Design a protein around this ligand. Structure first.
Ligand SMILES: N[C@@H](CCC(=O)O)C(=O)O
Ligand SMILES: N[C@@H](CCC(=O)O)C(=O)O
Ligand SMILES: [Cl-]
Ligand SMILES: [Cl-]
Ligand SMILES: [Cl-]
Ligand code: NA
Ligand code: NA
Lengths: 253, 253
């Protein structure tokens, strides 16, 4: 009978606080693609839930000196949440410590920048320093760069790391703002870029996808919900409901 | 020494092919392709040996309406006649209920292969007419998608395909391509395979976009301990750029 605890994070258009003059409470506070997803999962699998924003405001990465995780990943490891329903990338290092459903969305890292310039790829950024570039701190993009042995991406990480106090940000919204107000390119997931460039006609994706990954629902390692949620996602996909949800939340001359 | 794993697969270019050789080849040495390269990488990461066997009935796998029984590679896993299926095997709702899959090594969707020079632009345009026949591989995921779909366009299409099945359902993608080339016929084909085919025959084209979204995964019997191990190995390979390199090698008008 117990309601599942669902950790999440604010990220447009996946999870947002509803706009209202009327003060809102509990789950009624939230809306977005991942909220619609959670509701559909709850009806298919027959559970109730309580949404809680991850307290540290992080997606999750491992501390390279003490070995501890943070963010939603740590919430799951510690059994403080039953599910993480968010744009949470399924990654090699995370799958070793938590479980994930199969993906509800597929994406890759790409670049958000202003229009009208000769920059066309990550290699173009890597070879210069006048245009600064960075990523969300303690997320999957940062971790990809931090771990990569690929020359272009390892050069980019050395720059990000050197300039971390300025170029690593706490949210995608902070990264967008840096693009809009300084000479800065943001390494951003492509699904989110698609949302942002439809609303900011002076911004564009630069190049293609650097990698390929999916977003999945996170569970603690060994949870029986993991496979059940995979099957429900696959149902939702085939019925057309994921595509409908994407259209709803994603909607220039 | 540990028992070698029996790996079921199916001939499908450029995933799995017999090598061209004037010299007679034996055993695993007979085969090449994207999935063969994937299998080799998995074997070194996970430390197993293996024996490749072509699925005996020549099918991917679907469930019989009357007797409830599966066929193809899905059935070989259900019956423990193979340890793994390493092939372009779509992860689907109905299959995940009876076998296990790794997370995807490639993402794709159903689309349409047809000859160039047509006003037909979508599945809707095909469904509304009958002069141009259309169909799919018998007993695979595309056929099953149409047979199960409650979406109007696709249910209309399935009624036509089912009526005409002895003529429009084929036993391989190869046979579907030949029907496109030798009659007034459009083939419902997975997008990654369309990409391969249209790069080598400049008379053919994709029509419309993707009708759905799915992944290819390594199949295992339900409950297999290899499932999650192979997911982790695939995520490592992705991270490192090796899946991308393999796709470029095998897909390189
Ligand atoms: N979605 C990412 C955060 C954003 C990013 O890293 O670009 C994650 O799951 O960590
Ligand atoms: N790859 C498909 C077969 C081809 C198709 O159905 O289009 C399967 O896993 O069934
Ligand atoms: Cl580049
Ligand atoms: Cl899985
Ligand atoms: Cl054309
Ligand atoms: Na895991
Ligand atoms: Na399964």
């Amino acid at each position: 009978n117990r309601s599942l605890i669902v950790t999440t994070i604010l990220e447009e258009p996946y999870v947002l606080f509803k706009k209202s003059d009327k003060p809102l409470y509990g789950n009624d506070r939230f809306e977005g693609y991942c909220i619609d997803l959670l509701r559909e999962l709850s009806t298919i699998l027959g559970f109730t839930y309580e949404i809680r924003l991850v307290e540290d405001g992080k997606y999750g990465a491992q501390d390279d000196v003490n070995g501890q995780w943070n963010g939603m990943v740590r919430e799951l490891i510690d059994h403080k949440a039953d599910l993480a329903v968010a744009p949470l990338a399924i990654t090699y290092v995370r799958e070793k410590v938590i479980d994930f459903s199969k993906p509800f969305m597929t994406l890759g890292i790409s670049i958000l920048y202003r229009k009208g310039t000769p920059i066309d790829s990550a290699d173009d950024l890597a070879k210069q320093t006048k245009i600064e570039y960075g990523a969300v701190e303690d997320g999957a993009t940062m971790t990809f760069f931090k771990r990569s042995k690929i020359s272009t991406y390892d050069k980019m990480w050395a720059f990000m790391s050197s300039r971390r106090q300025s170029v690593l940000v706490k949210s995608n919204e902070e990264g967008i703002q840096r693009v809009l107000t300084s000479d800065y390119a943001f390494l951003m997931e492509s699904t989110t870029i698609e949302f942002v460039t439809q609303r900011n006609c002076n911004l564009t994706q630069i190049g293609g996808l650097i990698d390929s990954k999916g977003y999945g629902v996170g569970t603690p390692m060994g949870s029986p919900y993991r496979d059940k949620i995979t099957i429900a996602i696959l149902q939702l996909q085939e019925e057309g409901k994921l595509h409908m949800m994407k259209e709803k939340w994603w909607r220039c001359p």
